Design a protein around this ligand. Structure first.
Ligand SMILES: Nc1ncnc2c1ncn2[C@@H]1O[C@H](CSCC[C@H](N)C(=O)O)[C@@H](O)[C@H]1O
Ligand SMILES: [Ca+2]
Ligand SMILES: [Cl-]
Ligand SMILES: [Cl-]
Ligand SMILES: [Cl-]
Length: 259
DNA sequence: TCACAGGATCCTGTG
DNA sequence: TCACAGGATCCTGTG
């Protein structure tokens, strides 16, 4: 199921399997919502949270615009698969005006669609030799058809209030894989998230957590130990096949850990 | 005789 | 991107 935008680490292809394991709830809390692959596709009320304010503000803005507003901008900046100089201009405009619609248009044209915003709040992703495509308006339409049930927020995961009846879904930056958002992460942040999860458990609140125990030769030892206190679902089909067929090393063990 | 240039080391951020 | 210039500190040497 579609996410609002292309996004490193999105859960589009895994969502059906994940919904399999979800519990019932009064409110769905997507604590690290990212590209919104989870939030757009679960029953509301939904609280979509992400520490990257510019992206959250961009979603809040999308609610009131039409695909036509997007094309007008793309037209006025004469962007294309090869408009490197035009892309730099849009980038500067987004950086001094901070209008979220521009951030939305920029993301379609940058390096691997990455949205990188530095400390000063500027977008520094280089040109990606690309522009809108078949899925652009699709993800866009899917966002419009399902954003009603969402309340957006941009707080650090531990500063979000968790209410009884909340089903907390947690898909954070993973230490052992590669993403720009990994700059907001560390062994300490992870200890904090796992303690938070344990508390939710102490309070009888259901949670679900996405991660990887092994990737390319690296393993997350503390996460493996911690996962033994809960249910564990292995999701990478290839990883599971190879496990039964006993024949390979350095695979990606994608898991879903839950109480 | 304390101001300051430049070094060293670590780490951050960009193309 | 994943190299790698150059911040950020703290420190050492210089007149
Ligand atoms: N401390 C923190 N609190 C909340 N969100 C955080 C965070 N640190 C990083 N993030 C956010 O963690 C997200 C991990 S990626 C999650 C992707 C999402 N499930 C999808 O389908 O697109 C990123 O979007 C990042 O901005
Ligand atoms: Ca370079
Ligand atoms: Cl003097
Ligand atoms: Cl490059
Ligand atoms: Cl002197």
């Amino acid at each position: 199921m579609l996410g609002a935008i292309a996004y490193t680490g999105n859960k589009q292809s895994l969502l059906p399997e994940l919904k399999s394991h979800f519990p019932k709830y009064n409110r769905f809390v997507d604590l690290f919502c990212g590209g919104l692959s989870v939030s757009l596709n679960v029953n509301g009320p939904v609280l979509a949270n992400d520490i990257q304010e510019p992206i959250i503000e961009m979603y809040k803005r999308l609610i009131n615009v039409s695909w036509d507003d997007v094309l007008k901008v793309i037209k006025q900046y004469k962007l294309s698969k090869t408009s490197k100089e035009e892309f730099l201009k849009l980038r500067e405009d987004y950086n001094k005006t901070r209008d979220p619609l521009l951030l939305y248009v920029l993301h379609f044209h940058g390096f691997s669609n990455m949205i990188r915003i530095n400390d000063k709040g500027n977008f520094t992703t280089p040109f990606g030799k690309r522009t809108i495509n078949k899925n652009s308006e699709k993800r866009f339409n899917h966002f419009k058809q399902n954003c009603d049930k969402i309340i957006f927020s941009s707080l650090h995961f531990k500063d979000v209030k968790i209410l009884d009846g909340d089903f907390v879904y947690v898909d954070p930056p993973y230490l052992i894989t590669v993403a720009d958002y990994n700059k907001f992460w560390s062994e300490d942040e992870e200890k904090d998230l796992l303690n938070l999860l344990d508390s939710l458990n102490d309070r009888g609140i259901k949670f679900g957590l996405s991660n990887v125990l092994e990737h390319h030769g690296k393993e997350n030892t503390l996460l493996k130990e911690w996962s033994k206190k809960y249910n564990v679902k292995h999701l990478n089909k290839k990883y599971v096949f190879n496990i039964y067929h006993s024949k390979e090393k350095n695979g990606t063990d994608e898991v879903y850990i839950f109480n």
